[PDB]
Nucleic acid binder design. Structure first.
Length: 337
RNA sequence: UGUAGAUA
């Protein structure tokens, strides 16, 4: 390194200033303590002081966008720099988007830059992803970037991402990074576009609720979706209430079904299991005794009306001195009051 | 008694 920096790593300069590290901006930024020294002084800095530094981040900007320390520095400028340094940084970035989006460091920046630019540059920076949509949605770095777009970017500039997901919904609603994206779209995108998705979604409601993350997506719509889409799902559940509340994943979804259904639907779903006797005993006998099902049951009571709840507990008197036996049942006896 | 994304 240089002594200047060596002296900084040894604490030999207590009131070190920006001007005093001219010619060494870069080096500093690829060094943890110096990157950190700059990140701080940039916030409390004169316009002359920032530009000084800027001058030296520009010609090796890409290098610092990928450095493990150099990347917070570029990001500071997006936060606290001038409009012109922000567009200038954009410049730097044009036609480098895809690569930085997939890089461990570059995409943090990209993620920040996407947050601090007018729609014009925002709109521009995104189309560079066109035709590598699915490649980014399934990347470990790329995926927060796409998510970052769906959030920051005006929705009408992202039809290419709705298209890209066509007939792809299940593979992604059943993917690790794939399903967070699908949530964003349903949180941000226009009716025009959340229609094909919600459509494929319903195509595999039964399967998705059994997926590791697939359910998180059905779970999303139940909570946040339009009441027309809820009812369709709850309907997928109606009947299957027994076979799914014993599922490790599917239980979590019936849960939110009983929570987010119509008043009516809700009182029908609940009742379904208070009178669809299964085997030796009745329906909710198993649900009580089951490692996952009991939460579904405890939820039954939660959302219930005083009328239909009374009836539930009346069906749960015949086994009071029966649940003490099974421990998962034990968490139920502490409610019949 | 029960489930999910990347930096010093």
């Amino acid at each position: 390194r240089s002594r200047l920096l060596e002296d900084f790593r040894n604490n030999r300069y207590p009131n070190l200033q920006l001007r005093e590290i001219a010619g060494h901006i870069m080096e500093f930024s690829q060094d943890q303590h110096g990157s950190r020294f700059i990140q701080l002084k940039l916030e409390r800095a004169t316009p002359a002081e920032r530009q000084l530094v800027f001058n030296e981040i520009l010609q090796a900007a890409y290098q610092l966008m990928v450095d493990v320390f150099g990347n917070y520095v570029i990001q500071k400028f997006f936060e606290f720099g001038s409009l012109e340094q922000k567009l200038a940084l954009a410049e730097r970035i044009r036609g480098h988007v895809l690569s930085l989006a997939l890089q461990m460091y570059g995409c943090r920046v990209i993620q920040k830059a996407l947050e601090f630019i007018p729609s014009d540059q925002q709109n521009e920076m995104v189309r560079e992803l066109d035709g590598h949509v699915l490649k980014c949605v399934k990347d470990q770095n790329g995926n927060h970037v796409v998510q970052k777009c769906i959030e920051c970017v005006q929705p009408q500039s992202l039809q290419f991402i709705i298209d890209a997901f066509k007939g792809q919904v299940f593979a992604l609603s059943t993917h690790p990074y794939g399903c967070r994206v699908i949530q964003r779209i349903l949180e941000h995108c226009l009716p025009d576009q959340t229609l094909p998705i919600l459509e494929e979604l319903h195509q595999h409601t039964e399967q998705l609720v059994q997926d590791q993350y697939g359910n998180y997506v059905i779970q999303h719509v139940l909570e946040h979706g339009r009441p027309e889409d809820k009812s369709k799902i709850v309907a997928e559940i109606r009947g299957n209430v027994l076979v799914l509340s014993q599922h490790k994943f599917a239980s979590n979804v019936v849960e939110k079904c009983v929570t987010h259904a119509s008043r009516t639907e809700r009182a029908v779903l609940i009742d379904e299991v208070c009178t669809m006797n299964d085997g030796p005993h009745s329906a909710l006998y198993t649900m009580m005794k089951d490692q996952y099902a009991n939460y579904v049951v405890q939820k039954m009571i939660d959302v219930a009306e005083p009328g239909q709840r009374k009836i539930v507990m009346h069906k749960i008197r015949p086994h009071i001195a029966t649940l003490r036996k099974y421990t998962y049942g034990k968490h139920i006896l502490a409610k019949l009051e």
